Each structure stands twice: as structure tokens, then as C-alpha cells.
Design a protein around this ligand. Sequence first.
Ligand SMILES: C/C=C\C=C\[C@@H]1O[C@](O)([C@H](CC)C(=O)NC/C=C/C=C(\C)[C@@H](OC)[C@@H](C)[C@@H]2O[C@H](/C=C/C=C/C=C(\C)C(=O)c3c(O)cc[nH]c3=O)[C@H](O)[C@@H]2O)[C@H](O)[C@H](O)C1(C)C
Ligand SMILES: Nc1nc2c(ncn2[C@@H]2O[C@H](COP(=O)(O)OP(=O)(O)O)[C@@H](O)[C@H]2O)c(=O)[nH]1
Lengths: 208, 99, 385, 83
Amino acid sequence: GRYIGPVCRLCRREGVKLYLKGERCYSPKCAMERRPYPPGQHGQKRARRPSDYAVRLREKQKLRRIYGISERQFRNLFEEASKKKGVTGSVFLGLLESRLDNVVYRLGFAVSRRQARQLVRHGHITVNGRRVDLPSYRVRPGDEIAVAEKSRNLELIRQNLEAMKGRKVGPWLSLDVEGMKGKFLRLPDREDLALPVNEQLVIEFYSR
Amino acid sequence: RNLSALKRHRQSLKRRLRNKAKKSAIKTLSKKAIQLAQEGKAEEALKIMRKAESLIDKAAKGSTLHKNAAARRKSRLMRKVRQLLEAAGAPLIGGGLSA
Amino acid sequence: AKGEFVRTKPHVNVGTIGHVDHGKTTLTAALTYVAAAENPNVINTAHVEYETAKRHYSHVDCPGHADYIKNMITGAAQMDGAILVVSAADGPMPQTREHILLARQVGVPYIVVFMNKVDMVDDPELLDLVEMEVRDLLNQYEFPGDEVPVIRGSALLALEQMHRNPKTRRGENEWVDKIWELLDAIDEYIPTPVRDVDKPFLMPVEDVFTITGRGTVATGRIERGKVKVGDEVEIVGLAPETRRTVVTGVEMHRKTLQEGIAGDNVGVLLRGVSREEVERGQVLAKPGSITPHTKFEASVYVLKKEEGGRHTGFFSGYRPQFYFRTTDVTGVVQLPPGVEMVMPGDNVTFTVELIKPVALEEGLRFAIREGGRTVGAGVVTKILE
Amino acid sequence: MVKIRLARFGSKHNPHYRIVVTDARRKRDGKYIEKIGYYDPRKTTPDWLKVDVERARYWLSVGAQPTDTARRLLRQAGVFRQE
RNA sequence: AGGGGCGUAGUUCAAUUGGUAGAACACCGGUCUCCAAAACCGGGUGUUGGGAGUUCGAGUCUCUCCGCCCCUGCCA
RNA sequence: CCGAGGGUAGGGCCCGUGACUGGGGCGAAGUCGUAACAAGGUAGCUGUACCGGAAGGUGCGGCUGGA
RNA sequence: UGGAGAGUUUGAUCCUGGCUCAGGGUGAACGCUGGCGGCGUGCCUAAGACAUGCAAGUCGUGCGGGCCGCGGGGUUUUACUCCGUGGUCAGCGGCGGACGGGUGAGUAACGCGUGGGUGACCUACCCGGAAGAGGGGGACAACCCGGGGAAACUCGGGCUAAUCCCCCAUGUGGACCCGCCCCUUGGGGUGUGUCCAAAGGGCUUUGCCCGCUUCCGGAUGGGCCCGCGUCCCAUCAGCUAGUUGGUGGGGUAAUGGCCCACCAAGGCGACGACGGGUAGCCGGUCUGAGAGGAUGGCCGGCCACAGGGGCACUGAGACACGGGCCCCACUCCUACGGGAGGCAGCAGUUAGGAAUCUUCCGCAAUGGGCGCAAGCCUGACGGAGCGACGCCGCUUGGAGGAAGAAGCCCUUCGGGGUGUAAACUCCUGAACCCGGGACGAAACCCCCGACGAGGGGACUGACGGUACCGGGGUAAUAGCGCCGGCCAACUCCGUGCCAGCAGCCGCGGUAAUACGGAGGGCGCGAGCGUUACCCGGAUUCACUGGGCGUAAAGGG
Ligand SMILES: C/C=C\C=C\[C@@H]1O[C@](O)([C@H](CC)C(=O)NC/C=C/C=C(\C)[C@@H](OC)[C@@H](C)[C@@H]2O[C@H](/C=C/C=C/C=C(\C)C(=O)c3c(O)cc[nH]c3=O)[C@H](O)[C@@H]2O)[C@H](O)[C@H](O)C1(C)C
Ligand SMILES: Nc1nc2c(ncn2[C@@H]2O[C@H](COP(=O)(O)OP(=O)(O)O)[C@@H](O)[C@H]2O)c(=O)[nH]1
């Protein structure tokens, strides 16, 4: 179930800095900022020209690890992302952004991704009226994500909701900071998502 | 230890006897009819074949022969008899046949 | 065509003993015919039953005889009182001796006696001698042989006089009567124990059967708590691992039971289980209660030669057999250093490693035998594995 | 004879019958002469009972005994109203 | 559950007058070699199935116990 | 009259099995030789025929995938 | 809107070619591990044998009784109990037990698929139409009595009722022979002769409701027949006497050698007859770029079977799963002369097996049979149970937290790694607790309106005190494979061609990223591996899409 374990252990390995912890992973010590190398006993020696396979693996893991989505879903959602008319490149990336908890994280609310999930698994999060608790819930157009009321007074929801004053949300989401709402104006775009991932490879890895 | 479907059996045997007789009749009564039809009894022949043609449609009333079954038995009778009486006969007293 | 069983009278089960042939088995037959008059309406241990107008009795008639000891034990390990049978011909017989020292090896409180084959060669001193022999023997094994009900009354006589007619009340037979003498010598003097029902559940398994059109049935002597139709249970002990099942049958002497309580020898039809999966020895308990183990330290006392046991003692590495609830599993013996010298009548503690998983729970006594002779008994202390 | 019954479709605890004309002898969920409608008994949607008047009526006019409850729905659909 | 068998080196087998248990071929160990095979020296390498009993001494003679084979057992 | 089945008798197909026997495949370090690969020490291969512990040899004809 | 290739023959190379791997799939089983839920799904083998209970009945508004509880004495009391009347046992009579449910044994075949034919037919109940329903007679049960009998039950005498049976009439019409006409395989009209109908039951009573009879038509469901399609062996090549056709018969709802006499000698076969093997067919399912290949379990349609086997009776329909007759084998009862059964219906047992579930609750819904109706029956069905068997959703926490505790492992003894991982700080609240708590159920039926239309009224929930909702609320499981190359992942020690690994190539003979353990890593996660089988890759049976001088392959 959703990994759970040494994550700023993958900020490493994938060698492409990751902030799955948020605050710290954002500090002068993303773990990455002290060891730009993979873990293990070796981790700092010549590296064989990674095979054509390896690259794709790493590209995929880069992405999948970047959400916490466990393979099964990851790869599953991928297939849906295939039949759907269009470029799998956009689509998929888009269908990865439609992930409730994700958006949660995408719209402040939670410092990081792994945290945004729990907010969902406890009710704290709410949609177009009625609340929801499935991290897999897929957001659709014109739907706002609101915090619950019992929470609004919680020490956490505060500080986290504060970091919004000043900072602007992604070009496909709004935000009633005082009224914790913000809608999902439209599926995000390749460019809007500045992710250290080369989707086109992650795609090739599922061909074989 | 049992079930009451036996009602259907006893019953079975009963009417299995009812048309068993109605049937054997039509037969023994059809034969004699023609068994004369070649002799030349004309009049008497059409007499029996007339009783024959009755007993056939009769059985046709219940679950014994029903429709066409009876109609066939008749056609062959009103056939054999006739086809016979033309071997020197001429249909006396208008029996069931119609010339 | 089955017919329920309904409670009224308390319940205490018992069985016969005494040297082979003497008088049991045939006598056991009698006791049934008798309490069958004015109630109710109308090689291998044989459970049967019968009830006095005062109490409910479950009767176990171990075939006796030598060779048949392991099987014998599991019998007097479940009965509250033994009917020591003796014939008014031969007297205190060897097996009558062995079916005695055992009783004291299993606790068995109080032992009613009974002189059988009475209608044979009268003799002044004899009938008054035999009864003297016995008691002189019961105290020879520390029993209340002096205050023991010694009824006389050759039972076959009772039987064949009840075979002519299945109906006869008390007094009407100078031969029946001599039966009720035992049916009142037992009714009285033989207590009625207290089986903890507040406790979980447990039931050693005696025999296992397969009732056609139903499945496997396991008969045993309830230990603690109780069990009614539809209760889950763990078959702890012996085999791969503790399997689980839902009791779907409980019957007392072939009569539907509603919730057999402790001290009730009932047959439990388990849901979805094969006769190969259920062995003797193992246990039926409350799911979560007890666990299979093979390494344990037990406080043991090794009998003295004069007390029956060994007379040469032993060292570490000796492999005797161990008796728990209803079976005999073998075990390797390992001593806590320097304890190497373990002689007779000594009292110490070491560790055993059984070659077969068994339901052990600390607080459970057992019994070490070997070469035909209880070498010593003890109790489970800490459990290693 | 030829009835106008309800055939059960949809998943467990989620029934969805299909108003249909079938020989009274067929399995209720087996092959049928002609569907003329559906009915969601739990509504869960504005449209939970549509029927095909033109056909419902035709069958009734050639001998198609409806079900106690099947009839109730043709009724509610407005098949027997004559004005 | 109860009877009766059967269990010795690595295998097939000999000692059953109660007396450290050998016989053959194997394998093991050295030497030569990379390492073997071969050759040459050198070796019983065994839980006598376990554990106890009697006995001065048990493969043998008692009992019990493990596995296996055979026979008879076994409806709450 | 027909007729399930039973009975006598004799055929066909297939399967299992049989003292003994034929060759076959496989199997670290057995025995005999030396046919072939370099005119492989008699160019090789070949159909057939006779012969020989064994490879094989010789006859007749053929091939070059030999000089 | 759709196609990826790698390892392996050599000192090396190119080609040919086989083997092998990476991808999906499954009614799965086996290993380690296993928390929740939903939806699916679960004897693939012995079509082996089966305890026990239940799987089909219902109408008294068809008819006469038995018996019991009650109008309450028939006369005046227990005389002729006539009957009032709700019931309950069986009989009579009707409709249903031929559908639903099970299984895949048989079958290579018009069995199935697909398209048609029937001037060669049938169809209970249900619609629309026409015409009827007049007289009469009679039996057998039930019951009374007698008899044999272990029983299952049976024989005999005699009452009695009907919508049971039969006779006459009626003849809208229908059936049949012969004639005529239309039409064309037996269809439609017509004339003379002959032949054929029928039942009453309840009411709220010259009228309704339910029945009945005859014909015509509608529906639906069928029978039969025909073209094309439908596996392996040709080391199987010839097969055929009811055989192929005819005529006249019997038979049937109907065609037909389906069956029968008589007659004629035919029919079929390399376009694969006959025979042997295997197998139920299909919609579809898996795989594939596609063409194909494989398959036919769940669900849906058709077929066939009901311990093995033969036959018929009733009937609209069966040669009949829980009907019958008989043989057989097996198992059981027996008062030894005769009786009994057939889970491939649902649960369950045992056997076989690598392996496949509860003797569950409810007719509340849907569907069915019978009833005017109330309603009764219904292991069809609606649910519940068990099993990670599969899919899908969810959990084991989140945010802080050290140039970095300990322990374990490496080390060029500086240190490096496991690792923000822990500890530690706050923060949320799976479970559990208390309260509340469904939808699925609206008509049958009743009342106003005519028992029509339309409006209103009442009863009814197995799953369940479940889902779900409100409040309260504890940091709360992790495993399995792999890390030489293919293929993501490397070091130390142990061992020393041993022990062992191994899908292919191959690893081990004293410095082994390959054996075994550890640290570390990679992958996937309530799972993860393994075995078996199908497709792919395999343009490796090549239609799409290959070949034959020397690689297999040109026939003398
Ligand atoms: C013994 C077999 C199975 C036991 C099973 C279990 O035992 C128990 O664990 C039991 C718990 C205490 C147990 O451990 N039993 C295990 C033991 C228990 C021992 C207890 C009590 C004693 O006390 C020291 C007790 C007998 C004591 O001995 C004395 C007798 C001495 C006799 C000497 C022999 C003499 C003359 C003789 O002629 C003789 C002979 O008899 C046999 C052979 N050849 C002879 O020549 C006296 O009678 C005393 O009373 C439980 O009861 C369990 O529930 C169980 C029944 C399952
Ligand atoms: N006359 C008589 N015979 C008896 C009596 N008890 C037993 N028997 C007979 O003697 C033998 C007893 O053996 P059994 O009943 O088996 O006793 P068990 O062997 O001790 O169980 C049998 O033959 C019995 O019939 C008795 O009291 N009187």
C-alpha cells in the first residue's frame, strides 16, 4: 500500500531531486542536498551506460514515485490514458493530475503529496458539496475542492493555508483562500506541469 | 414415502381403456364393412361403413383420435369399400357414399 | 427420527475397572437394564449410559486387560469415580492391582467396589475375607479402602432375570436388589465435582468418527467452558498447524444436546473437516486459546522405586514418553547444567523437546512413562518454542 | 400464453428490469420475443420507467397477459387510458 | 487404536556357543597436478534406528519408542 | 411377428503383459584396433554383391563432393 | 490508429536453423505470507456410490362423502341429524406435474450454425369473429359389510354425485367419398349422399362472472425437409439387402423404405465413401498489427441424457429428471411369498483427485403453476455463508527530526552505508463505541366511478438494526521474488567439480556479483513466486508472408 517508508531515499537514486516530504525536502537538505547519489553501499562509483531499458524504467519510476501511486494503479490509469483519443503524453500526465489528493496538494492545503492523501482519508477534504475520501477520486471540470468545517480551525490547516497569501495557483485552478475553495478550471498541460519527467520514455517502457 | 401423482396414473389406466375399446371397435367394425365390400353385399356394406364412419368421428370428440387422424381412417374406408363395390355392384340403399 | 436430550439431573460419568474377566463388561450391561426399568419411560472402550431416579450417568467400560493401557488411562483420566469390580472366586488379582495404582496416578476420587460372581461357593470367612482383602489393598495404594462401599451381588444373575422381562422394580429380585445396592452406594458417597464454566473452552479428543451424511465427529471430555451449535473453534495440537472450524453438531449419547457444558462427553460434528485432519490427543478450544509448542520446562517429581518408578535413575539424553490430556507423544530430555544426576524420587526441573506439537499452556500437569511404568509426573512451567 | 413480464438485469442490490414480451414458459432472464421497455425500481435517475406504447398496446391486442406488477407499470406509463 | 514383521559402515551382506562389529568394493586422506582420473603410501570412515532394562560385558536377551510394510479394529 | 437382455460359436480393431531376443539413445577419466579428416599414409564417396572380431576389405559400375 | 526484439553453433564472420527468454490469458492447483470491503466466482477428475430434509402442486365457485367445532332441535326428549355453516382426511373430477432446475455420458450427425421450404403438418392456456348450449338415460370411487395379508396394499357384494361416461336431436359450420369450377404437389369454392357437438358453477339473478361445444382467423411454441459450413488418421480404399428406386398398402399431425409385401437392380466413393480416434455445436472467450491460432467454463440459444437398457400408457404436447411396465447390476427391508430405491434438482457425505463451498435465511421482489378471489405451493429466484480463485477500491499514517544515535555490514581505519529511516515533536483518526437507520413496495385487494378509463385507500422487507449518517475515537500488518548475461539490482564471509544452482548460454576443482548466509540493492505488494495449458514473439506450415545448385528440399 502506497509505499510508506524512506522517500527522500528516492529524491536520491532517481538523482532528480524530489520533495515528497514538502517543507524539509524544500529546505537546505532535501537529503538530495548532501548526497546527489543513489543509496546502497556503492552508490558513488562509475555507472555502466544504463541500458535502453534502464532509462525507461528510471523515467517511469521517476514519475510513479512522484505521486505515490502504486504501480497497479499507475500502469492501469496508463492504459485508460491510451484508448482515450489523443496523445498519451498529455492525457496520462493529465489523468495523473486529476487525482483528488494530488489537486489537494496542487492547491496548497497540504505541504506535500503523501500528506494530501491522508487529508482525504480522514474527510478533511470536500468536493462540490458532499465530501470525499478516495485518493483516487478523479476531479472533473468546474468542480471546486473545499476543506471541511471541523478542520478549518486545526493548527495544521492554518499554517498550510497561510502559505497561499502571495503565491499563485496553477493556470487551471482558482482559490478562495479565506473560503478554501478553488475550482479545477481544466485539465493541466504538459508545459504547465514542469516535471523532471520525459513522458515519451515512460511511454516506451510499457511497449516492452 | 410417496407423492400424489398416482391420481394421474389410476386415471391414466382408466381412459387408457376407454379409447382402447373405442379404438378396437372402429377396427373390427371397419374390416367387416369391407369384408363384405368385395363380396358385394352393397346395401349392407354401406350400412356398416355408415356405422363405421360414425364411430370414427365419435372417437374424434375426445382424446382418442382427434382431427385428420379420423379424417384419414374415413377416406380410406370410403375408398376401399367403394373401390370394391365397383367390381360388380352398384351402391344400393344410399349408404354414407355419394355417387 | 432423532429426538433431543433434555437436562434435569446433574451429570457425573464413571467407569468399571478390576482384573480382566472378573466381572465388568457383563456387569456394566446390568446397571443399564436396571435404571431402565423405572426410567426413562419405556479391545475398545465402550461408552453407554443409564440414569438412576436421582442422577445422570455416562458409563465408560474400558475393555481392560494388559496391552490395553494407553487406552485404559484416557478412560480413568475422565471419570469422577471408578467401580472396582472383583469376583467372589479368585480375589485380589494382578490387573485388579494395575487398574488401581493407575487410578491413583490419575487422581480419580473415591472408588466404589462390588463383589461379583457371588452366587458361587459360599464360605463363612470368604465373603467376609474377600471384602477384607480388597480394603487391605486399597489402603495399600493410599485409598479410603476402610470406608469404601463394598456391595456384594453377582450381576449376571441380575441381567438374565431382566432378560426374561425388561420390567422389574426394586426389591422384587434378591438378584436385582444387589444391583441397586450399588446404585445407592454410588448415588451416595460419590461426589459431584465442579467444572469451571466461566473459563474459555477446551475438549481433549478421545475418538474420532465420521457420521455418514454429516462428516467428522470428535468425542472428548470437556475441560473448561462450553460449546453450542455454531461456535468457531481451533483444533490445536498435532499436525501442520492449528486448523479452524465451526462446530455444527453437539450430541450427548446420540441425543441432541443444546450446549454441552464441562464434564459432558459429547460428540461434536465440525464443519468442513476430514477424518485424516482430526487425530486423538489434539484439542478443541476457544479460538485464540492455547497454542502448539514443543519446548518446555516442567516442574517434575520422579517417582521412587518403592513408589513404582525407576531404580537406577538416569542422565541427560533419555527419551521417555509424555502423557497430556489424551495421548502419548515422545520427548527428548535436556537438563539445566550439573543437573546431570537425576535419580529416583528426586525433584528437579529440566527441559523437554517433543517430536510432535502439543497444546501446552503452563499450569498443565502431565505424566512421564517408559518401559511400562509411570516414571514420574510434573507440570508445564515456561514455554521455549 | 404470451405474457408481458419483467426480466431482471443489472447487478446485485442494483436491480434493473426490462419490460418484455416472452412466452410465459421461458426462463425469466432467457431469450425474449421483444423488449418494449425498462424499469429501475430504485429510480436513481429521472428516467426510471419508459415503455413503448405503440408496441405495448399491439401485444395486448393479440393476447399478451401482463403481470400483476407488469400491468401496473404499463398503466403508470399510460397504456390503457383511452380519453 | 491393538497384534506380527523389518531396520549394522557409503551400499549390498557376515559374526546370533551374550565377548569393540569385520569382509569386499567403494569413498576419504595425503604425494604428483590447476584440479581430477590413474599410480603409490595411509586410513574403518558405523547414532548396530532411538532410549532405557538385566547383566562382569550386549548386534544378539527384556520393555518402551520412531518410520515403513501386512493383518484385524473404527457411525456423535 | 418384432424385441432388451442372456447363451453357444467364430471373425475384426485396439490396449496390457511374456521366458528369451534385436537393434537404439544416453552415461568424466574401461578393452581392441586406426576406417575418416592433410595422395590421412591404399584419393574419398557411392548402389550392389561376397567376405571379415571391429572399424572395414575386395569385385562390378557410377560420382568428383580427388590429383 | 496499427507491427520493437534478445541469448545460444565459430579462433573470428555471414547465412541457414532449432532450442530458449522478455508479453498477455486461466473454473486453476502448489509454496511463503495474509488486514477490510464490493462485485464476480468456486468438482476441469468417478455420467462413481450415496444417510437425512426439502426441490410441485393447486380448485369445494366441478361432485358425493368422513370427521370435528358450532346455528339449533327436526316431533315435544338422543326417532326421518333434512341442513346452517368456517373448517379438516382422503376419493371423484379438472388444469399443472413435458415448463423451471441439473449434466455433457452419447453424438462427426441436418446434431449445431446460417439461409430457406411445407399444395406434407401440429399447437393446451391467451386474443378477434360466427353459431350454439334441447331432450334424455348410465357407471365407478368415496362410504357399509365380508375376506387374505408382515407390509407396501389387494379381492369381492352393494349404495351414490356430478363439468365422469353413452344414446337421440340440432348442423352456424366441420370431416369423408364421387362430380364440377378456380388454383396448381394434399388449397380454395361448390353440389348429392353420409358422418359429428356440448356441462354446469357462483352470484348481488330474463343480467353478469367463470366455464362448455363447433368452425374460422390472430399469437406464441413446435415437427419435417432442403443448400452451404462443421476435427485427426489413407499405415483405412473400397462400402451397401431395406441396400438404391418403383407400385399398392400399414403408419403418422405430416413428408418419407419410417415399416411391409411385390417388382426393378440400384446407391455411394480420392470433390475421401466405409472404418478407427477424439468431441456436445453456437453467441462468444483468450491471443494477434492483421490474416490467423487456441478455446466453448460463467451468462444466453439449440441438442442430448436422467443408475445401465428396452417399451408404451395418459395427453395439446412425453415414449416423460423427483409417472408407469419389464430386464439387468447394486444397495436395503421381509413374518422369505413378495416388497424398496435411483441427488447429472438444493444443501450434505464418501470415493477418485494437484483441486472446487453452507445439511443457511426469505417467498419481501422478479418469474411460474392452480384459484373469480382471498391465497397456496415454488432450495426457479432474492439474499446470506465459506475460499485472496479473480477483478476493483482502501489500510498499516502525515509533517517536522542529526554534516547523521545505537546495532548490523563494508573499509585504502580518515571513514562509508542501512538513513529522515528510527528515536523524538506535534498532527490526523482503519478499527472499535453511543444515537439515528434506508431505497428496493406498489398493485393484487378495497371504496367513489360500470368489476372499463381515471382518482383515492390499506396490507407487505428475507438481506438488517446491514448500507448509509450524526457524535465519540486508539499509531494502529508486511510480505514474496530477484540482483552473471539475456534483465532492473554488488560487496564480505562460507564452501572448494563438494554441498548446491540451472529457462537458454552455463556457474563450483582454495580470492565464486552464478552455490549458502549476511549487508546492501532492484521489482512488485496483500500479495508475491512456482507448475500445467493457449496465443505471441515463430515470415519457425509463410493467404497476408518462406523455400529446394552447396544449408532440410527436383520425382531416375
Ligand atoms: C499415569 C498415566 C497418565 C497420566 C495422565 C495425566 O496425569 C496427571 O497429569 C497427574 C496429575 C497429578 C499425573 O501427573 N500422574 C502421574 C503420577 C502420579 C503419581 C501420584 C499422584 C503418586 O503420588 C506421589 C501416588 C500414586 C502415590 O503412590 C503410592 C503408590 C505406590 C505404589 C508402588 C507400587 C506397588 C506397591 C506395586 O505393587 C507395583 C505397581 O503398582 C506397578 C507395577 N509393579 C509393582 O510392583 C500411593 O498409592 C500414593 O497415592 C493428570 O491427572 C492429567 O489430567 C492426566 C490424567 C491426563
Ligand atoms: N454367574 C455369573 N457369571 C458372571 C458374572 N459376572 C461375569 N460372569 C461371566 O463370567 C465372564 C465375565 O467376563 P466379562 O463379563 O467379559 O467381564 P470382563 O472380562 O471383566 O469385562 C463372562 O462369561 C460372564 O458371563 C456374574 O456376576 N455371575
